[PDB]
Amino acid sequence: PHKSSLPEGIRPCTVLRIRGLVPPNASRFHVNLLCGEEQGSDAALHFNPRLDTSEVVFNSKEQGSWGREERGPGVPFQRGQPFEVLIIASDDGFKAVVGDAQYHHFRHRLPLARVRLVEVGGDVQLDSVRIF
Amino acid sequence: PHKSSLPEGIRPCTVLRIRGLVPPNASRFHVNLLCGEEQGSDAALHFNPRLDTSEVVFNSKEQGSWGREERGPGVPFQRGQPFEVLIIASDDGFKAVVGDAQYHHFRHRLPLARVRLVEVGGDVQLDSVRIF
Numbered sequence: 001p002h003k004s005s006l007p008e009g010i011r012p013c014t015v016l017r018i019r020g021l022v023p024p025n026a027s028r029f030h031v032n033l034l035c036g037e038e039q040g041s042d043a044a045l046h047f048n049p050r051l052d053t054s055e056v057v058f059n060s061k062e063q064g065s066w067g068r069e070e071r072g073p074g075v076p077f078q079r080g081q082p083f084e085v086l087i088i089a090s091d092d093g094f095k096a097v098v099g100d101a102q103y104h105h106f107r108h109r110l111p112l113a114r115v116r117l118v119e120v121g122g123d124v125q126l127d128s129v130r131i132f
Numbered sequence: 133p134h135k136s137s138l139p140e141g142i143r144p145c146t147v148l149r150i151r152g153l154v155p156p157n158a159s160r161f162h163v164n165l166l167c168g169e170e171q172g173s174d175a176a177l178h179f180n181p182r183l184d185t186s187e188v189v190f191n192s193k194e195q196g197s198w199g200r201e202e203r204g205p206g207v208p209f210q211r212g213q214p215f216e217v218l219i220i221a222s223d224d225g226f227k228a229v230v231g232d233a234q235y236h237h238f239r240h241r242l243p244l245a246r247v248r249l250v251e252v253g254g255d256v257q258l259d260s261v262r263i264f
Protein backbone atom coordinates (compact mmCIF):
# COMPACT_ATOMS: atom_id res chain seq x y z
CA PRO A 1 0.00 0.00 0.00
CA HIS A 2 0.76 3.74 -0.31
CA LYS A 3 0.61 5.76 2.91
CA SER A 4 1.77 9.41 2.65
CA SER A 5 1.78 12.19 5.28
CA LEU A 6 0.49 15.63 4.28
CA PRO A 7 2.01 17.50 7.21
CA GLU A 8 0.83 20.91 6.00
CA GLY A 9 -2.69 19.65 5.37
CA ILE A 10 -4.31 19.97 1.96
CA ARG A 11 -5.28 23.48 0.64
CA PRO A 12 -8.12 24.16 -1.93
CA CYS A 13 -7.02 22.70 -5.37
CA THR A 14 -4.95 19.77 -4.19
CA VAL A 15 -4.93 17.11 -6.95
CA LEU A 16 -4.21 13.42 -6.14
CA ARG A 17 -3.46 11.31 -9.20
CA ILE A 18 -3.54 7.53 -8.80
CA ARG A 19 -2.40 5.19 -11.58
CA GLY A 20 -2.53 1.44 -11.24
CA LEU A 21 -3.92 -1.89 -12.29
CA VAL A 22 -6.88 -3.83 -10.85
CA PRO A 23 -5.62 -7.40 -10.27
CA PRO A 24 -7.64 -10.10 -12.04
CA ASN A 25 -8.78 -11.59 -8.70
CA ALA A 26 -9.48 -8.22 -7.01
CA SER A 27 -12.24 -7.73 -4.44
CA ARG A 28 -12.03 -4.07 -3.33
CA PHE A 29 -9.53 -1.28 -2.93
CA HIS A 30 -9.60 2.13 -1.31
CA VAL A 31 -8.22 5.65 -1.35
CA ASN A 32 -8.54 7.27 2.09
CA LEU A 33 -7.98 10.87 3.21
CA LEU A 34 -7.57 10.63 6.98
CA CYS A 35 -6.85 12.75 10.08
CA GLY A 36 -4.04 10.49 11.28
CA GLU A 37 -2.56 6.98 11.53
CA GLU A 38 -4.24 5.84 14.76
CA GLN A 39 -6.32 2.88 13.59
CA GLY A 40 -9.98 3.75 12.92
CA SER A 41 -9.68 7.49 12.96
CA ASP A 42 -11.57 10.17 11.07
CA ALA A 43 -11.85 9.94 7.25
CA ALA A 44 -12.73 13.03 5.23
CA LEU A 45 -12.93 10.73 2.18
CA HIS A 46 -13.17 6.97 1.85
CA PHE A 47 -13.31 6.08 -1.88
CA ASN A 48 -13.96 2.35 -2.28
CA PRO A 49 -14.31 0.67 -5.66
CA ARG A 50 -15.82 -2.76 -5.06
CA LEU A 51 -15.39 -5.25 -7.84
CA ASP A 52 -16.87 -8.06 -5.70
CA THR A 53 -20.23 -6.25 -5.38
CA SER A 54 -20.19 -4.01 -8.53
CA GLU A 55 -20.32 -0.63 -6.81
CA VAL A 56 -18.13 2.34 -5.87
CA VAL A 57 -18.87 3.67 -2.37
CA PHE A 58 -17.94 7.10 -1.08
CA ASN A 59 -18.23 7.88 2.60
CA SER A 60 -16.76 9.78 5.58
CA LYS A 61 -16.06 8.58 9.13
CA GLU A 62 -16.18 10.46 12.45
CA GLN A 63 -15.67 9.27 16.01
CA GLY A 64 -15.75 5.68 14.79
CA SER A 65 -19.04 5.92 12.87
CA TRP A 66 -19.34 5.71 9.10
CA GLY A 67 -21.49 8.44 7.59
CA ARG A 68 -24.21 8.21 4.98
CA GLU A 69 -22.86 6.28 1.96
CA GLU A 70 -22.89 7.65 -1.57
CA ARG A 71 -22.59 5.48 -4.67
CA GLY A 72 -21.15 6.52 -7.99
CA PRO A 73 -22.83 5.86 -11.27
CA GLY A 74 -21.77 2.40 -12.41
CA VAL A 75 -18.29 0.94 -12.00
CA PRO A 76 -15.50 2.57 -14.07
CA PHE A 77 -13.08 -0.15 -12.96
CA GLN A 78 -12.47 -3.64 -14.30
CA ARG A 79 -10.54 -6.66 -13.10
CA GLY A 80 -7.43 -7.11 -15.16
CA GLN A 81 -7.40 -3.51 -16.27
CA PRO A 82 -5.41 -0.33 -15.60
CA PHE A 83 -7.01 2.87 -14.33
CA GLU A 84 -6.26 6.53 -13.69
CA VAL A 85 -8.09 8.37 -10.90
CA LEU A 86 -7.91 12.05 -10.13
CA ILE A 87 -9.23 13.19 -6.77
CA ILE A 88 -9.53 17.03 -6.90
CA ALA A 89 -9.85 18.69 -3.41
CA SER A 90 -11.53 22.10 -3.85
CA ASP A 91 -13.51 24.13 -1.27
CA ASP A 92 -16.78 22.44 -2.33
CA GLY A 93 -15.67 18.82 -2.01
CA PHE A 94 -13.77 16.06 -3.78
CA LYS A 95 -14.31 15.62 -7.52
CA ALA A 96 -13.43 12.10 -8.61
CA VAL A 97 -12.28 11.72 -12.20
CA VAL A 98 -11.83 8.20 -13.64
CA GLY A 99 -10.55 7.67 -17.16
CA ASP A 100 -11.69 10.52 -19.40
CA ALA A 101 -14.69 11.68 -17.37
CA GLN A 102 -15.82 13.23 -14.12
CA TYR A 103 -17.33 10.38 -12.14
CA HIS A 104 -18.76 11.78 -8.90
CA HIS A 105 -18.55 14.88 -6.73
CA PHE A 106 -18.40 14.13 -2.99
CA ARG A 107 -19.24 17.21 -0.95
CA HIS A 108 -17.32 17.83 2.24
CA ARG A 109 -18.59 16.42 5.52
CA LEU A 110 -15.41 17.06 7.58
CA PRO A 111 -13.33 20.25 7.33
CA LEU A 112 -10.63 19.98 4.70
CA ALA A 113 -8.15 21.24 7.31
CA ARG A 114 -8.45 17.88 9.10
CA VAL A 115 -6.79 15.77 6.35
CA ARG A 116 -3.19 14.84 7.18
CA LEU A 117 -2.68 11.47 5.52
CA VAL A 118 -3.39 9.76 2.18
CA GLU A 119 -3.72 5.97 2.07
CA VAL A 120 -4.11 3.80 -1.04
CA GLY A 121 -4.54 0.11 -0.43
CA GLY A 122 -6.44 -3.10 -0.82
CA ASP A 123 -6.49 -5.19 -4.01
CA VAL A 124 -4.67 -2.81 -6.32
CA GLN A 125 -1.33 -2.81 -8.09
CA LEU A 126 0.12 0.67 -8.15
CA ASP A 127 2.03 2.38 -10.93
CA SER A 128 2.21 5.82 -9.24
CA VAL A 129 0.61 8.09 -6.62
CA ARG A 130 1.26 11.83 -6.87
CA ILE A 131 -0.05 14.77 -4.87
CA PHE A 132 0.04 18.01 -6.88
CA PRO B 133 -6.05 23.93 -32.91
CA HIS B 134 -8.20 23.09 -29.88
CA LYS B 135 -10.42 25.98 -28.74
CA SER B 136 -12.99 25.47 -25.98
CA SER B 137 -15.07 27.95 -24.01
CA LEU B 138 -15.28 28.14 -20.21
CA PRO B 139 -18.81 29.61 -20.01
CA GLU B 140 -18.68 30.32 -16.25
CA GLY B 141 -15.01 31.24 -16.60
CA ILE B 142 -12.28 29.13 -15.10
CA ARG B 143 -13.38 28.03 -11.69
CA PRO B 144 -11.03 27.54 -8.76
CA CYS B 145 -9.40 24.08 -8.79
CA THR B 146 -10.19 23.67 -12.53
CA VAL B 147 -7.90 20.97 -13.95
CA LEU B 148 -6.98 21.12 -17.62
CA ARG B 149 -5.48 17.90 -18.95
CA ILE B 150 -3.77 18.02 -22.36
CA ARG B 151 -2.47 14.84 -24.02
CA GLY B 152 -0.66 14.99 -27.34
CA LEU B 153 2.48 14.41 -29.39
CA VAL B 154 5.27 16.83 -30.35
CA PRO B 155 5.79 16.27 -34.10
CA PRO B 156 9.36 15.39 -35.12
CA ASN B 157 9.67 18.79 -36.88
CA ALA B 158 8.33 20.99 -34.09
CA SER B 159 9.22 24.68 -33.63
CA ARG B 160 7.02 25.72 -30.69
CA PHE B 161 3.48 25.11 -29.41
CA HIS B 162 1.29 26.89 -26.87
CA VAL B 163 -1.47 26.53 -24.36
CA ASN B 164 -3.29 29.86 -23.80
CA LEU B 165 -5.96 30.90 -21.29
CA LEU B 166 -7.59 33.97 -22.90
CA CYS B 167 -10.45 36.40 -22.35
CA GLY B 168 -13.77 35.80 -24.11
CA GLU B 169 -14.24 38.61 -26.59
CA GLU B 170 -13.66 38.29 -30.31
CA GLN B 171 -11.48 41.42 -30.00
CA GLY B 172 -9.40 40.02 -27.13
CA SER B 173 -5.91 38.61 -26.96
CA ASP B 174 -5.42 39.13 -23.21
CA ALA B 175 -3.81 35.94 -21.85
CA ALA B 176 -3.99 35.05 -18.18
CA LEU B 177 -1.52 32.29 -19.02
CA HIS B 178 0.66 31.74 -22.06
CA PHE B 179 2.41 28.37 -21.75
CA ASN B 180 4.94 28.05 -24.60
CA PRO B 181 7.24 24.99 -24.98
CA ARG B 182 9.95 25.95 -27.47
CA LEU B 183 11.84 23.09 -29.09
CA ASP B 184 13.65 25.49 -31.47
CA THR B 185 15.20 27.43 -28.54
CA SER B 186 15.03 24.64 -25.88
CA GLU B 187 13.04 26.59 -23.27
CA VAL B 188 9.49 26.71 -21.86
CA VAL B 189 8.20 30.23 -21.34
CA PHE B 190 5.32 31.31 -19.13
CA ASN B 191 3.90 34.81 -19.46
CA SER B 192 0.74 36.90 -19.41
CA LYS B 193 -0.42 39.58 -21.86
CA GLU B 194 -2.66 42.57 -21.40
CA GLN B 195 -3.64 45.27 -23.72
CA GLY B 196 -1.00 44.07 -26.18
CA SER B 197 2.05 44.04 -23.89
CA TRP B 198 3.77 40.93 -22.54
CA GLY B 199 4.61 40.93 -18.83
CA ARG B 200 7.79 39.51 -17.25
CA GLU B 201 8.63 36.09 -18.69
CA GLU B 202 9.10 33.12 -16.40
CA ARG B 203 11.13 30.15 -17.59
CA GLY B 204 10.64 26.61 -16.44
CA PRO B 205 13.67 24.49 -15.47
CA GLY B 206 14.74 22.60 -18.57
CA VAL B 207 12.44 21.28 -21.31
CA PRO B 208 10.36 18.15 -20.48
CA PHE B 209 9.22 17.82 -24.10
CA GLN B 210 10.98 16.06 -26.98
CA ARG B 211 10.42 16.19 -30.74
CA GLY B 212 8.77 12.94 -31.77
CA GLN B 213 7.65 12.07 -28.24
CA PRO B 214 4.18 12.12 -26.58
CA PHE B 215 3.37 14.26 -23.54
CA GLU B 216 0.82 14.84 -20.77
CA VAL B 217 0.36 18.32 -19.26
CA LEU B 218 -1.89 19.24 -16.36
CA ILE B 219 -2.75 22.88 -15.76
CA ILE B 220 -4.26 23.25 -12.31
CA ALA B 221 -5.96 26.60 -11.53
CA SER B 222 -5.22 27.01 -7.82
CA ASP B 223 -5.69 29.75 -5.22
CA ASP B 224 -2.12 30.95 -5.69
CA GLY B 225 -1.75 30.53 -9.46
CA PHE B 226 -1.53 27.93 -12.23
CA LYS B 227 0.43 24.76 -11.39
CA ALA B 228 1.94 23.18 -14.51
CA VAL B 229 2.49 19.42 -14.29
CA VAL B 230 4.42 17.63 -17.04
CA GLY B 231 4.75 13.86 -16.89
CA ASP B 232 5.09 12.73 -13.26
CA ALA B 233 6.24 15.99 -11.62
CA GLN B 234 5.04 19.49 -10.93
CA TYR B 235 7.06 21.62 -13.34
CA HIS B 236 6.39 25.29 -12.62
CA HIS B 237 4.05 27.42 -10.53
CA PHE B 238 2.89 30.62 -12.31
CA ARG B 239 1.35 33.09 -9.87
CA HIS B 240 -1.85 34.87 -10.84
CA ARG B 241 -1.72 38.18 -12.67
CA LEU B 242 -5.14 38.39 -14.33
CA PRO B 243 -8.44 37.58 -12.58
CA LEU B 244 -9.67 34.06 -13.10
CA ALA B 245 -13.11 35.37 -14.04
CA ARG B 246 -11.64 36.93 -17.19
CA VAL B 247 -10.47 33.56 -18.53
CA ARG B 248 -13.13 32.27 -20.99
CA LEU B 249 -11.23 30.36 -23.71
CA VAL B 250 -8.69 27.61 -23.65
CA GLU B 251 -6.68 27.48 -26.86
CA VAL B 252 -4.04 24.90 -27.77
CA GLY B 253 -2.05 25.47 -30.94
CA GLY B 254 1.25 25.65 -32.78
CA ASP B 255 3.33 22.59 -33.74
CA VAL B 256 1.52 19.92 -31.76
CA GLN B 257 -0.81 16.97 -32.38
CA LEU B 258 -3.55 16.54 -29.78
CA ASP B 259 -5.00 13.31 -28.57
CA SER B 260 -7.32 14.91 -25.98
CA VAL B 261 -8.10 18.14 -24.14
CA ARG B 262 -10.28 17.74 -21.05
CA ILE B 263 -11.54 20.29 -18.53
CA PHE B 264 -12.31 18.87 -15.08
Ligand SMILES: OC[C@H]1O[C@@H](O[C@H]2[C@H](O)[C@@H](O)[C@@H](O)O[C@@H]2CO)[C@H](O)[C@@H](O)[C@H]1O
Nearest residue numbers: 046048057058059060066067068069070
Ligand atom coordinates in the same frame (compact mmCIF):
# COMPACT_ATOMS: atom_id res chain seq x y z
O1 LIG C 1 -19.55 2.87 4.39
C1 LIG C 1 -18.30 2.29 4.03
C2 LIG C 1 -18.08 1.00 4.81
O2 LIG C 1 -18.98 0.00 4.35
C3 LIG C 1 -18.93 -1.18 5.15
O3 LIG C 1 -19.94 -2.09 4.73
C4 LIG C 1 -21.23 -1.52 4.91
C5 LIG C 1 -22.10 -1.77 3.68
O4 LIG C 1 -21.55 -1.08 2.55
C6 LIG C 1 -23.52 -1.29 3.93
O5 LIG C 1 -24.36 -1.69 2.85
C7 LIG C 1 -24.06 -1.85 5.24
O6 LIG C 1 -24.19 -3.27 5.14
O7 LIG C 1 -23.18 -1.52 6.32
C8 LIG C 1 -21.89 -2.11 6.15
C9 LIG C 1 -21.05 -1.87 7.39
O8 LIG C 1 -21.11 -0.49 7.76
C10 LIG C 1 -17.55 -1.82 5.02
O9 LIG C 1 -17.47 -2.97 5.87
C11 LIG C 1 -16.45 -0.83 5.39
O10 LIG C 1 -15.17 -1.38 5.05
C12 LIG C 1 -16.65 0.49 4.66
O11 LIG C 1 -16.35 0.32 3.27
Ligand SMILES: OC[C@H]1O[C@@H](O[C@H]2[C@H](O)[C@@H](O)[C@@H](O)O[C@@H]2CO)[C@H](O)[C@@H](O)[C@H]1O
Nearest residue numbers: 178180189190191192198199200201202
Ligand atom coordinates in the same frame (compact mmCIF):
# COMPACT_ATOMS: atom_id res chain seq x y z
O1 LIG D 1 6.85 36.32 -23.38
C1 LIG D 1 6.30 35.40 -24.33
C2 LIG D 1 6.55 35.92 -25.75
O2 LIG D 1 7.92 35.71 -26.10
C3 LIG D 1 8.25 36.32 -27.34
O3 LIG D 1 9.64 36.15 -27.60
C4 LIG D 1 10.44 37.05 -26.83
C5 LIG D 1 11.64 36.29 -26.26
O4 LIG D 1 11.17 35.23 -25.42
C6 LIG D 1 12.54 37.21 -25.46
O5 LIG D 1 13.91 36.82 -25.64
C7 LIG D 1 12.35 38.66 -25.90
O6 LIG D 1 13.50 39.43 -25.55
O7 LIG D 1 12.17 38.69 -27.32
C8 LIG D 1 10.88 38.22 -27.71
C9 LIG D 1 9.88 39.37 -27.64
O8 LIG D 1 9.07 39.27 -26.47
C10 LIG D 1 7.44 35.69 -28.47
O9 LIG D 1 7.70 36.38 -29.69
C11 LIG D 1 5.95 35.72 -28.17
O10 LIG D 1 5.25 34.90 -29.12
C12 LIG D 1 5.66 35.22 -26.76
O11 LIG D 1 5.88 33.80 -26.69
